[PDB]
């Protein structure tokens, strides 16, 4: 299962937040780190963050709750990054939009056999705004659907 | 063991490379994927990539050799990204250099207990180009040896 090294990493991460070493992360503490990371959350936003993982309802984050927070955020980050990189793969000219031409080319690269109608269908289904191209937001929706 | 899921992810990745399905990845196949990703490697670069993992000396990459390649690249990418992110956290003004003052204020905020003299020494040691501040390349050197 868990390796000693893994646990060590999670302890180091927890300690970064748990400045006073009391074994809980407060809104105060969470905010301090978030600011170092270049964000500017309000108290209410910080409370919301905690509430998402606050299994015991005590209003602060303990170690197992922090592990849940990390498990979730790691998965989400990974997925988001994968999709973003894929978008960049498709958007060959870097203009922020996937054209039918671009989509056709990439599908061919990837060895997925498509008919003309199929590529069009694919674009049509993801194209919410009717411009006949797929922007990032659209691509994300297509991918999380 | 890897989980069954993990192994599945690696098989998927392998399959993406092994275009012809013969069980080995050639420089042609490698190049194909690289190009599909928007890169443009030379034939020499491709040969080198294979050479680094080609334990049996047949000039192609089999599944266990591919695992080695992936493992290495995944580790490196992960390390690079983490270091780059930390760089960005410390370089508060975004000028591409970490100053002693920047380092000091972040560290303190994040609960470290380094004296001013210790922070100055950190900068001094990492500033191997001698210009007074720590750029990204120096930061990488500091973090990797």
């Amino acid at each position: 299962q868990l390796t000693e090294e893994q646990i060590a990493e999670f302890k180091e991460a927890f300690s970064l937040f748990d400045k006073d070493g009391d074994g809980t992360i407060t809104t105060k503490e969470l905010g301090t780190v978030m600011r170092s990371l270049g964000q500017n959350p309000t108290e209410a936003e910080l409370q919301d963050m905690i509430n998402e993982v606050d299994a015991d309802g005590n209003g602060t984050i303990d170690f197992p709750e922090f592990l849940t927070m990390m498990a979730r955020k790691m998965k989400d980050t990974d997925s988001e990054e994968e999709i973003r990189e894929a978008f960049r793969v498709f958007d060959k000219d870097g203009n922020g939009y996937i054209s039918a031409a671009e989509l056709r080319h990439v599908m061919t690269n990837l060895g997925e056999k498509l008919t003309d109608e199929e590529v069009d269908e694919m674009i049509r289904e993801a194209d919410i705004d009717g411009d006949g191209q797929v922007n990032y937001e659209e691509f994300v929706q297509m991918m999380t659907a | 063991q890897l989980t069954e899921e993990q192994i599945a992810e690696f098989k998927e990745a392998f399959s993406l490379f092994d275009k012809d399905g013969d069980g080995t990845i050639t420089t042609k196949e490698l190049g194909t994927v690289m190009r599909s990703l928007g890169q443009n490697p030379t034939e020499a670069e491709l040969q080198d990539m294979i050479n680094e993992v080609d334990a049996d000396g047949n000039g192609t990459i089999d599944f266990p050799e591919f695992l080695t390649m992936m493992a290495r690249k995944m580790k490196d990418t992960d390390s690079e990204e983490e270091i780059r992110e930390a760089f960005r956290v410390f370089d508060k003004d975004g000028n591409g250099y970490i100053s002693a003052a920047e380092l000091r204020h972040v560290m303190t905020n994040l609960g470290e207990k380094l004296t001013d003299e210790e922070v100055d020494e950190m900068i001094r040691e990492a500033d191997i180009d001698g210009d007074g501040q720590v750029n990204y390349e120096e930061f990488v050197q500091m973090m990797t040896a």
Binding site: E82, I83 | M34
Partner: peptide
Amino acid sequence: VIRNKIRAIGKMARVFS
């Protein structure tokens, strides 16, 4: 399967850069 392929390429994109 298409979506799988897409995720796969995105993964590789990050590993190989």
